[PDB]
Each structure stands twice: as structure tokens, then as C-alpha cells.
Amino acid sequence: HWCRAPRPDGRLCERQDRLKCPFHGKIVPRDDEGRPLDPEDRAREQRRQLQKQERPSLTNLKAQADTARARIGRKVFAKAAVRRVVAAMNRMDQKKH
């Protein structure tokens, strides 16, 4: 099976995904023109398209942390995460021994 989703470039999606295509969500069977064979699936996609159409001065201490690179560092550098890093490594140390 193929996603066969209608891309903005006019070509059907050729991604080979078992269940879900990341750029188009769930994968449903489609014909040569990229139309879902199930009429219910066509209606659901139309509803999704309608929903999409409907849709001091200096950075404070909290505002400075509000970004991408800080968020990933906070998750990586955590008391529970570091302990889980050690705890996971302890279990392979038992396997190594």
C-alpha cells in the first residue's frame, strides 16, 4: 500500500508506511487519483480540511528559558533522568558482570 496523499506539488505521496504517514496522519487506501476508496474517509478528510481553514521589554528570567534549546536541556538534565540514566546503566552492569 501507498499513502497516495495529494501533495501541493500535484504528485501523489509515495511514502511506504505501514500504518501512519507523518505528513498526512493515518493512511487510507486510495485510487490512482489519490481519493480514499471509503466514502466515510473522504468525508472525514473534508471535515479535517474545514477545521484547518477555521484555525519589561527585555526577556525575563522565565522568558529567557522559553525557547527550544533550553527545553531539551531541561529534560536531558533532570534529577530523575540522570538517576534513570544510572539505573539503566546499573542494570546492564549486572548483565556485564
Partner 1 sequence: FIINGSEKVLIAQEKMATNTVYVFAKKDSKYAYTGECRSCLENSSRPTSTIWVSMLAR
Stretch that binds partner 1, among 18-26, 48-56, 63-71, 89-97 (CB under 8 A): 89-97
Per CB under 8 A, 53 contacts partner 1:
no
| Residue 24, contacted partner among partner 1, Zn ion, none, CB below 5-8 A by kind | Zn ion
Applying CB under 8 A, the span of 46-54, 61-69, 72-80, 87-95 interacting with partner 1 comes to 87-95
**Tell me, what amino acid is at 55?**
R
Three-state secondary-structure class, residue 57: coil
Which grid cell is 45? 478528510
* Residues making contact with partner 1 (CB under 8 A): 85-86, 89, 93-94, 97
